[PDB]
Amino acid sequence: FETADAGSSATYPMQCSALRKNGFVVIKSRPCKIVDMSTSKTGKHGHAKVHLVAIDIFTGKKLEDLSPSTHNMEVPVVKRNEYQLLDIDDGFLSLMNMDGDTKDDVKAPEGELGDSLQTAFDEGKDLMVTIISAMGEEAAISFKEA
């Protein structure tokens, strides 16, 4: 008895210039969403370097980065999945696939979005929620009425 997993790092290395706005980037072993970018020439026969400002989505924390524009950067392979909420249990929301129903591990989102989700489920009005999965961590990001 084992668990099969092909070796797949959740980062494709791409490029400092190929990272764009609303992006996904790995700054110091955390997923983050590129919210600001700027190219900047350094010298007089110099090259351009990229300054990146991004927000870590699982904590919502601002992380910055500086690199020469010709260097490679890790890009997380995020997967957004659209699931169905059965019931909000003791902080750990119960979730449903297209047919399967495992997904019982996602912490109910602690923000005001999750509080309004709790109010919705409490007066019923059943929803489908959107969950992001990236580099080992998963989080509910956005509720949506079916």
Binding site: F1, E2, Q84, D87, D89, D90, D99, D104, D126
Partner: protein, 217 residues
């Protein structure tokens, strides 16, 4: 290294079938229970372990299963013989709470249909999943009798809030070697689902229905 091997389990399962098969022969079919317990797993912090394993034989052979099916699933249930629970009495049942409580508490395993599985939350309520019983999907191609045996065999190790878990392995009159193989397979499945494996298993009890709780580890 597998901390639990066959030999000690051979001896403990000899003494288990000893106490069941002559000492207190009862008036109903008892079931072997593996009760496991964790040490370092904090339920609020770690990733929840969840997993089902199809057994090579049968546990409790008289579980009470209910079929949420439409036409083909319902007709197959009428052919085999399992209580089929169609959308008819489901929408005739919607306007209550006590009756859904009665249904969920009365039949223990629920089996569903692919085209019913999405509005089971709607038509029913959260009570089934809250109890720990969500209807398992069954396709039209899938033979209903075979999948009924599947669901009467599947063992589920899944953390909910606590650190003691308990799973029925099998009956008490089936043969010694398959009981040994099953209990070893279930232990190994638990250890495989864990993070630190044998380091974080701490409690390993086998029982049937009564006082004697025959420890393995």
């Amino acid at each position: 290294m597998s901390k639990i091997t066959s030999s000690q389990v051979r001896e403990h399962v000899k003494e288990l079938l000893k106490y069941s098969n002559e000492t207190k022969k009862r008036n109903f079919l008892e079931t072997v229970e593996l009760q496991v317990g964790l040490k370092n797993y904090d339920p609020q912090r770690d990733k929840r372990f969840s997993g089902s394993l199809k057994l090579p034989n049968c546990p409790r052979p008289n579980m009470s299963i209910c079929i949420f099916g439409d036409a083909f699933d319902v007709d197959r249930a009428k052919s085999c013989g399992v209580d089929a629970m169609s959308v008819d009495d489901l929408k005739k049942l919607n306007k209550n709470k006590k009756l859904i409580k009665k249904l969920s508490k009365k039949y223990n395993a629920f089996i569903a249909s692919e085209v019913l599985i999405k509005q089971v939350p709607r038509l029913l309520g959260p009570q089934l999943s809250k109890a720990g019983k969500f209807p398992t999907p069954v396709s039209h191609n899938d033979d209903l009798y075979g999948k009924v045996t599947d669901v009467r065999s599947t063992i589920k190790f899944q953390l909910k809030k606590v650190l003691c878990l308990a799973v029925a392995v099998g009956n008490v009159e089936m043969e010694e070697d398959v009981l040994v193989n099953q209990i070893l397979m279930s232990v190994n499945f638990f250890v495989s689902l864990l993070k630190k494996n044998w380091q974080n298993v701490g409690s390993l009890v086998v029982k049937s229905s009564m006082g004697p709780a025959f420890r393995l580890y």
